[PDB]
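During the second year of the project, the team shifted from modelling isolated chains to modelling whole assemblies. The rationale, set out in the original proposal, was that interfaces cannot be judged from single-chain predictions alone. As a representative example for this report, we include one of the complexes processed in the last quarter. Its constituent sequences, exactly as entered into the pipeline, are reproduced here:
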Amino acid sequence: MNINPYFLFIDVPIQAAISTTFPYTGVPPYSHGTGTGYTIDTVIRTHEYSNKGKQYISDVTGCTMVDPTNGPLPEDNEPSAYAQLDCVLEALDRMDEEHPGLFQAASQNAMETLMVTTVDKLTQGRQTFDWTVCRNQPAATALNTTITSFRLNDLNGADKGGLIPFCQDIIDSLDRPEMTFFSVKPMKVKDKITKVEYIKRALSLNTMTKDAERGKLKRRAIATAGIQIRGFVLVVENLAKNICENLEQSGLPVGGNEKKAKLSNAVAKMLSNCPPGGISMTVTGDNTKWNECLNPRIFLAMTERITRDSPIWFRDFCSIAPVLFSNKIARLGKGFMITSKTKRLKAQIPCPDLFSIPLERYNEETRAKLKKLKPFFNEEGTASLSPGMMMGMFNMLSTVLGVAALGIKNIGNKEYLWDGLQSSDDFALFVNAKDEETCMEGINDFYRTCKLLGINMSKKKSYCNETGMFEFTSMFYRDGFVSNFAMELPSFGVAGVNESADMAIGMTIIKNNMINNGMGPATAQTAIQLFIADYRYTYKCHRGDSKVEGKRMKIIKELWENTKGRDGLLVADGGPNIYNLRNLHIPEIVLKYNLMDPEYKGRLLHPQNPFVGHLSIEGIKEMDYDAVSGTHSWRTK
Amino acid sequence: MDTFITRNFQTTIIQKAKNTMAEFSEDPELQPAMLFNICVHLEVCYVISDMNFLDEEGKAYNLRPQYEVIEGMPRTIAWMVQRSLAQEHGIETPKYLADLFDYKTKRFIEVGITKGLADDYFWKKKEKLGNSMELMIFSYNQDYSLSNESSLDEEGKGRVLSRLTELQAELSLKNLWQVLIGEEDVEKGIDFKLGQTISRLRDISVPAGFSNFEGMRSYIDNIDPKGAIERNLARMSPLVSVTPKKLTWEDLRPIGPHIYNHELPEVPYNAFLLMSDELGLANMTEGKSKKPKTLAKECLEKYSTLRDQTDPILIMKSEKANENFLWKLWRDCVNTISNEEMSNELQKTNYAKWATGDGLTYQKIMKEVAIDDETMCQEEPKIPNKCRVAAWVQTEMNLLSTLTSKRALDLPEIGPDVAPVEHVGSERRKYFVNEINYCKASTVMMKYVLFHTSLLNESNASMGKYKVIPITNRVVNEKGESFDMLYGLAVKGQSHLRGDTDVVTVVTFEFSSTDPRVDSGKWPKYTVFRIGSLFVSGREKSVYLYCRVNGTNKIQMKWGMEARRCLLQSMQQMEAIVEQESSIQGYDMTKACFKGDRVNSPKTFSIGTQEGKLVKGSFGKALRVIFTKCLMHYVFGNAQLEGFSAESRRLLLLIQALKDRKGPWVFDLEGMYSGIEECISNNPWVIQSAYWFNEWLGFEKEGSK
RNA sequence: AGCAGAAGCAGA
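Output from the structure prediction step:
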């Protein structure tokens, strides 16, 4: 007899057991070496979908600019970024008609939020491309460095505290003939650059291979932007989020229970609205080259139309971000490694010296890549990337565009209606008609409409089936029963601060993963068991009666023998594990307090214990946690 | 302060202000300050429109007032009604929010409640707005500024002044005046002028066909693009089509047919540690978890015959393996582990240097030197080889899912259950552990995790030293006896791991009972000697030493430390099923799921094939199989498996749709098939998954009839 | 050698 795991699906629906097909126990793929190859591939692909557009030379930076919008309509099924402005405006106007006053209300809301916003908000972001050193650094560090640099050049807008003066200083910096900044060469130094170089650096992008991405055989590159545009992208995203919140078909921003509720409600609404005797079909789609095909100029037009009835200054403020993105420049990374096997020698060619050697010495793939990149290359090692949205960062605005595309609902008064849900690069399109052939006709019309707006539905990865079952952002729906949001369950290991706050963090993460993400009771209890095992192994504080031997474990055993009331002991001191689903949120020390005897309880709760020492407001709370300032709140060396 | 807020303002005012805040999305508790202001604003905008009405002809004093409030109501409704009035009365619509509208002058009122001087605040509001609205600024210092003469008489002005009389002092007497924030602060930033350089950037950032940004703005603001979508679609080429195609069982051809081609070499064994062929030397202990070196020393002492072997018979040699060096390294390992010294370090000798690959990395030189040189060229990347199905993977799956008389898991305890939820959780864990703990896969996973933990510790703490790391496990049989299992020994090379992907070489010498010559294709990577024989079941079974050179990085070791997560993936899975059968029944189905009851019979799952016939196993068997599948996902996980799973999920969903008679359609089936097939290169689990997918697809086709 | 897989590591 030969076992066959897939035979399980014979007796159980695939959706019910979809978790079996997710290999999340394996080591996620990781990229080795340079990311320049993938960045060049992204640049080439972005320029390929738009080469038929208008090509010119920028008069501010001297880069090569490719503009596909208002270009010739596509004639094949390949990805097309030749979006038409008129159609985008029509879609936005229709969405306005379906949502009267929504655009201006959202613009006002975002504008007032931007008034009240302060510069410190910029510190809430993730890694950002600091230009003073040209590297990815924490948002706070980049903000501090840029503020100091602006101080050196008589730009003291950030002093006012508001985000408006900071962004005003940002734009005015582009006007300075020369800029002085603090660099690291390691020691601190002052360095001066010219206006064009500063403009290029501000518009520049850092590129790196995405690591630990699941479900993708080949790696792909991702982009981090500078600190200059963070305010403008923030306000644009706030505006787009305000619009999305009021859009029924927007699969954002809430996640979890509201996600399943939205899926089910959309499905039910769609069934109910079906003409009698007709049919409803659902298309699970995936957008190929979603980032590449979208054009920043289309987003500029979107912002201009959204702020139709808003003050001129706010219109300019919204419009800045698309302008900078449309002129973005991409850094190509670390370069390429050339090796002679006979001599066992290797040498790294950085991006500026990419063409310093004849292309014959490169492999075929890199040879073709560089040959196609030549025109868009710059002497300093960066590439012009006027089209495309490599960094993303317009998830809300892109979602707005997708929803607007979904809002047409009909073409030429044909006998079919279509609606659905859109979230970033994923979507589900429901179509009702009299027969499946008409539904496919409507889906073809939707595909053409999406082509028209710069969105390319992927024919290889999308599919259609009678309404009732589908997939959306890893959420599988089948006759009401939504399977789950398949997410990488994390390592319930040692959080890594101290003895007590460690346990607090562990139990809090278990509770949150239970309450926000999908995890049932038995899974959570096994999670608690695994975390306690890892905790005891890491701190070598196994149970007092546990015959494991060790340096500290010897004194732990001595305590166990000495102890009279063993029920009230912390696992850090070899005590029994008491945590469960009920008492997940309560700190262990308070749980056991009633049980612990004074003989050891007094020592644990020593006011002037020699371990914790001087404390800080961050120390006890820093995510936040609950704990007791006992003997298990010590710090590092 | 909220308790004080409730005093001066009724519940409706407070809730309207809180809702207006809700359209701002900053914690209302964080700063009631502007809340105060807005409610005050709202309040005045209501008192100006309390008793002032108009008649059907214009009498100043029926169902129509002389004013209409905008503040407080939802922003979308406020703006829609404001636009309605603007278009009805044919008056310029303010670009800012309107606070109040008049029915006599037909103009939009703006009101501002400031702290100090009013005239300067009035001029600042004019700067913000200009003349689009009439401004009614008030200030607690009996100050006022109205831009219209007959907007309101003295009665309303006096009433509002009186209403602010309490708040000008009432806050101070109860000590609240100090922390009262102004009203201009929330609107300090109004001025925003673009520089010349940014203006040019915006100018060149216009869609094709427009001269500059001004033209684009005029076009977007003025022209009505009705019919653009239909026109463009009509003039678009028909070639741009999704190409619908109804799916049928015939279209679903087997995936990756090349795996049936016998020319390609059968996929070889590549797992880090032996999984089903492992032979653990067992030593009986009753307690202390002694040192790994001491444990290995004792285990080898028990089997001195195998330990003392020095004239091996070379059974299999790998293509690029030095048999003498491997044997010398093994003897060095055994001697070092059997010595009296606590340290387990191996001297960096010639054979050790070769096995660890000492001094193989290419030297780095300056970029200029490489550029000048001609013979230096970028090496062509190595592509994974194509391989065909191998039966050893099927044997691994079959054997590791079979129950064994051992227990490797030693999970810790938890607090007593109280509530029903923890009771059901304990029941589920009881059943799932009772099933899993007695399976070979669990022991293999424990060996993997323990070895990876030891390897990571040694690599991080002994970067510059060669170390011998015994492959050890702790097991307990059903009768309570405790054994320590020694499966083999590992030599750790230099581990100066700086990057996450830095590779450290490990030489594994693992005991086994399988003769490699039985399945030659399974062992092209393994150098196998015959080290001895053992008495087990009345037969002298040969014991071989599988010697191999492998490599791992920090990421793989860290994930190996966390291999226990496999449990979770299995547990959750089965729990879902249990939950599902609870939904159909409405009560806990765990007992019925596992052991059944008078009402519901025990559940069964189609498990595999026997003589070409489908066979069914119990719930526990399916649990164990999915657990071994998770363990396999771990041991054979890499980019190929991720890609294959991601691309085949779509085909699985299409098959499910066909089963449900949901008449699924496809748009480009060949593309999906190519995406699935390009991931099947050399990963044994991926190849076997393709084979099983083909077989199960065939069975589903047979059933569909 | 080997890890590994579109490019690296096998100390700087």
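Chain B touches chain A through 188 residues (CB under 8 Å). Residues 440-461 of chain B form the longest helix (22 residues).
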